[PDB]
Amino acid sequence: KLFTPLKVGAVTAPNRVFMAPLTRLRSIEPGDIPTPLMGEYYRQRASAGLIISEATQISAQAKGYAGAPGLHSPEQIAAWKKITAGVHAEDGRIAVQLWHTGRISHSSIQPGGQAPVSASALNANTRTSLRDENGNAIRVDTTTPRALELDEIPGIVNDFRQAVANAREAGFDLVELNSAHGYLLHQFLSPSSNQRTDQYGGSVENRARLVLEVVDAVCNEWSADRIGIRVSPIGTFQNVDNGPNEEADALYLIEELAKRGIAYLHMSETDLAGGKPYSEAFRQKVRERFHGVIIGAGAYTAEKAEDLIGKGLIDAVAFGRDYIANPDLVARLQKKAELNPQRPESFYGGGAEGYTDYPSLHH
Numbered sequence: 001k002l003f004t005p006l007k008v009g010a011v012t013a014p015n016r017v018f019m020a021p022l023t024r025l026r027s028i029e030p031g032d033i034p035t036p037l038m039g040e041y042y043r044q045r046a047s048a049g050l051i052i053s054e055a056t057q058i059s060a061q062a063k064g065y066a067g068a069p070g071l072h073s074p075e076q077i078a079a080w081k082k083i084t085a086g087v088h089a090e091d092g093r094i095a096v097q098l099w100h101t102g103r104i105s106h107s108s109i110q111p112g113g114q115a116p117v118s119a120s121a122l123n124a125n126t127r128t129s130l131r132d133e134n135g136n137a138i139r140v141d142t143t144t145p146r147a148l149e150l151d152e153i154p155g156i157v158n159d160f161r162q163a164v165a166n167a168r169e170a171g172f173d174l175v176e177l178n179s180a181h182g183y184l185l186h187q188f189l190s191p192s193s194n195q196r197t198d199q200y201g202g203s204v205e206n207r208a209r210l211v212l213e214v215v216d217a218v219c220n221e222w223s224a225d226r227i228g229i230r231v232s233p234i235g236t237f238q239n240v241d242n243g244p245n246e247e248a249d250a251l252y253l254i255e256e257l258a259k260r261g262i263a264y265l266h267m268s269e270t271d272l273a274g275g276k277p278y279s280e281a282f283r284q285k286v287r288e289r290f291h292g293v294i295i296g297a298g299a300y301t302a303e304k305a306e307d308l309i310g311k312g313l314i315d316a317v318a319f320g321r322d323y324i325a326n327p328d329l330v331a332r333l334q335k336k337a338e339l340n341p342q343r344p345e346s347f348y349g350g351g352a353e354g355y356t357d358y359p360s361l362h363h
């Protein structure tokens, strides 16, 4: 079933082998600008059922990693247009993953050199990636954030809305909202990072308010069948847990998302260091509540993907590190060929080496 077609909102994927969103930190600074090298990398992977791009800033304030691209400036839009054109010339489909990093950021890359923003003024207690004076990736402790004022929230929603308009002009087929992995939307969702006492904190209805406002805004801006969302609502991701009622709160959010008729729900099931697997009973509860495509991710093998797709519990799988290393992952999985070995030392930063130099089966 991995190599059978799937309707994903407004587009049709020819197979269920998707490229997960992968931050690679190779954009130009100043300007957070995508490059022709990035275009080549994505073009190489155009046989994917769907490419989901690296996380991309909705605004300058959204930036948390040096080398991550934006989709807010004219120069960024022009560069992304070239990248999507190359994917489409090879008959691929590409979604842009949009983020605001919130507290997973550093003052030195924020507007004005000021503290980054979040739901509450609590440090993430982790690291982000900056660049040194020679342009090389380095890890730095996160800056303690400032809590957003209530009157600043509409601007955040508008920044998501505008980035989606920009994505449409840039030629993306779909947008994926990053509501996972401890970034800004997840910072509001989780009671561990959200201690607000206004209508954006406290109850699950209040904690989900921002993400649902964003979903409504972007569905109105473009179309519901162009919108996907990534969540990581069970377990701990980048020091952000999901609170003491994680299953119930996840099912609440999913039931609300379903009302908007969005294209897909993408679940990041565990982080790279691992965690408890999803139960089939939980997967069935998610199916009961969501009527679009469900994508699973997190250390999947083709065997596990086939098992869960065959069981009718998910529709597609997003592979991360296997897609870094195998531009033709679809053909390799379909033919049961060996995969290229991974070189994790070049996942972040640098240039062509460890990026565009992983070969296909045939030249």
Ligand SMILES: Cc1cc2nc3c(=O)[nH]c(=O)nc-3n(C[C@H](O)[C@H](O)[C@H](O)COP(=O)(O)O)c2cc1C
Residues within 6 Å of the ligand: 020, 021, 022, 023, 024, 053, 054, 055, 097, 178, 180, 181, 230, 268, 297, 298, 299, 300, 318, 319, 320, 321, 322, 347, 348
């Ligand atoms: C180098 C690297 C960068 C990542 N960047 C992102 C990202 O930009 N957005 C996101 O939602 N997840 C990100 N992730 C998670 C992946 O999308 C994916 O869920 C994970 O790699 C799946 O596990 P796998 O690599 O075992 O297939 C990243 C993972 C890696 C290894």
